[PDB]
Amino acid sequence: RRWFHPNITGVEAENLLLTRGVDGSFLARPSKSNPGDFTLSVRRNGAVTHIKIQNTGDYYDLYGGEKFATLAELVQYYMEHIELKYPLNCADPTSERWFHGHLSGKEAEKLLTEKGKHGSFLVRESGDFVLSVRTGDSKVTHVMIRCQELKYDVGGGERFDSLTDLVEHYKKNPMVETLGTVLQLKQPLNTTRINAAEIESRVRELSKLAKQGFWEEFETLQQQECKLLYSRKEGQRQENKNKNRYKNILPFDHTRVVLHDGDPNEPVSDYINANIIMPEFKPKKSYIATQGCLQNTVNDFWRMVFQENSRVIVMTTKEVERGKSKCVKYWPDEYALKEYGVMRVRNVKESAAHDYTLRELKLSKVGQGNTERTVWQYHFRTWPDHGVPSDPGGVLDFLEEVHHKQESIMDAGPVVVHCSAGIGRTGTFIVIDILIDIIREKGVDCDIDVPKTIQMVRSQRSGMVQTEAQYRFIYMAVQHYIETL
Numbered sequence: 001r002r003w004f005h006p007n008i009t010g011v012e013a014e015n016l017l018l019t020r021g022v023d024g025s026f027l028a029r030p031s032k033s034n035p036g037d038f039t040l041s042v043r044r045n046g047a048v049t050h051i052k053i054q055n056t057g058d059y060y061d062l063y064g065g066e067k068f069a070t071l072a073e074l075v076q077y078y079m080e081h082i083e084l085k086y087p088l089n090c091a092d093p094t095s096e097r098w099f100h101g102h103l104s105g106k107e108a109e110k111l112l113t114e115k116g117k118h119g120s121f122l123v124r125e126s127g128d129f130v131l132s133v134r135t136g137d138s139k140v141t142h143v144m145i146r147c148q149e150l151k152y153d154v155g156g157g158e159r160f161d162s163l164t165d166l167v168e169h170y171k172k173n174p175m176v177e178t179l180g181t182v183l184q185l186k187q188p189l190n191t192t193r194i195n196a197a198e199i200e201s202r203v204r205e206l207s208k209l210a211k212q213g214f215w216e217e218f219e220t221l222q223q224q225e226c227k228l229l230y231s232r233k234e235g236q237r238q239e240n241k242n243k244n245r246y247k248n249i250l251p252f253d254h255t256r257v258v259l260h261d262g263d264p265n266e267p268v269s270d271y272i273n274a275n276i277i278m279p280e281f282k283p284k285k286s287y288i289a290t291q292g293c294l295q296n297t298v299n300d301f302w303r304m305v306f307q308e309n310s311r312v313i314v315m316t317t318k319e320v321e322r323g324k325s326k327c328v329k330y331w332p333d334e335y336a337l338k339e340y341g342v343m344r345v346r347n348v349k350e351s352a353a354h355d356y357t358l359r360e361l362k363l364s365k366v367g368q369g370n371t372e373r374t375v376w377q378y379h380f381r382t383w384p385d386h387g388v389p390s391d392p393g394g395v396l397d398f399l400e401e402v403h404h405k406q407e408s409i410m411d412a413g414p415v416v417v418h419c420s421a422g423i424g425r426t427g428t429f430i431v432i433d434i435l436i437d438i439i440r441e442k443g444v445d446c447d448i449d450v451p452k453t454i455q456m457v458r459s460q461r462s463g464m465v466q467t468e469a470q471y472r473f474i475y476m477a478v479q480h481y482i483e484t485l
């Protein structure tokens with residue numbers, strides 16, 4: 001993911017492509033003219049083209065292109081399909097997990113001693129740098145990194161174009177001390193795990209200017225999304241193409257929900273754009289993250305709910321937003337009964353609350369009375385069209401009610417969560433739910449690691465949690481939950 005430059009202007013991007021690139025060279029960067037937006041800068045016929053990528057929270061929407069779950073998925077699509085031929089690699093180490101810019105040696109030794117383990121390492125500024133590694137069961141070793149005539153070295157041997165190239169080389173070819181100690185660079189020092197009780201302190205520190213600390217942390221998490229390019233073959237099958245709301249936003253094959261007992265006369269009846277999400281990766285405290293139904297996928301949706309024994313559905317979109325259909329109406333009007341293929345649904349009662357509507361549904365298979373179960377649909381109706389709510393209170397009160405409903409039901413299957421694409425708002429609600437559940441069981445004195453949790457959810461469905469605004473909202477929601485305990 002070296003084609004992503006987090007700190008360059010459009011002029012710097014043009015100058016980089018015109019002087020260090022060739023026709024077909026490209027890079028992506030965050031927008032400066034509209035923070036929250038991105039730009040794909042591409043060299044074609046000796047000139048540079050700047051293409052806008054927008055993300056208001058649901059997907060990356062490339063101008064003159066398609067809608068994607070991650071920037072890595074976007075780039076992989078066009079590199080395997082204006083030509084994107086040559087990534088122009090970024091030498092900036094700001095978004096590396098192990099880079100701690102202006103941090104002192106005293107503080108760095110305190111962090112490796114209190115939070116490190118064998119092979120924990122960090123790189124900090126001295127124009128020179130220091131590589132600090134903990135080894136043992138123990139001790140801290142400091143390796144001086146010289147910057148001489150724009151290249152990096154540890155005092156001998158090879159000279160690197162970037163700290164990234166230097167760190168990767170010494171991860172592959174470890175330094176050995178003359179008495180035998182292997183300076184193993186096993187893992188970056190963990191600085192994001194916090195005690196839940198100290199959430200306020202961390203939010204305060206992250207709200208300070210780095211763009212704030214939140215931006216730096218979120219972009220270091222995005223840098224790791226190239227580790228998550230898992231296969232999505234099933235969603236690409238001709239037979240499944242029109243079952244996807246967005247052509248290129250697909251479920252990973254390894255976690256997709258497989259639909260069994262399909263119409264024997266239907267060649268492909270096992271697909272739905274949905275993934276099982278398991279915390280720390282029981283059916284009960286698991287989730288199904290899915291897209292908003294299409295008219296042709298309503299029956300598949302109900303086959304999924306029935307098969308998985310799901311008793312709670314969380315809908316985080318209106319049916320229509322900004323004049324566009326985000327989810328078809330897959331449930332009957334209040335008091336009505338409808339058949340969706342082999343599935344029969346009665347809408348028993350609707351209850352309106354400030355931020356949401358609850359629909360008590362009875363789902364059963366046609367011809368089998370004894371299969372009836374109640375499915376509780378919580379429909380969050382006040383999420384803004386773009387961005388996130390200004391206050392997490394409403395979302396928390398809603399999740400608290402959803403949690404208690406699910407907890408009250410013996411052997412309930414995973415909670416189904418959906419929005420439009422099923423990755424932005426969906427991923428945001430699931431992550432908040434996972435984090436608050438840890439504070440429920442383990443109490444205020446528990447460890448929480450927001451980016452670790454999100455990377456874990458993102459390994460089960462593409463792009464869960466889309467934006468820096470949602471990333472900050474997750475911290476704000478955890479903070480508010482702890483503050484009202």
Ligand SMILES: CC1(N)CCN(c2cnc(-c3cccc(Cl)c3Cl)c(N)n2)CC1
Nearest residue numbers: 094097099216217220221224451452455
């Ligand atoms: C100051 C700095 N340059 C930015 C903040 N920082 C970190 C570190 N680690 C993560 C992390 C944690 C768990 C899983 C994943 Cl995948 C990630 Cl990437 C993160 N998001 N930010 C430290 C370096």
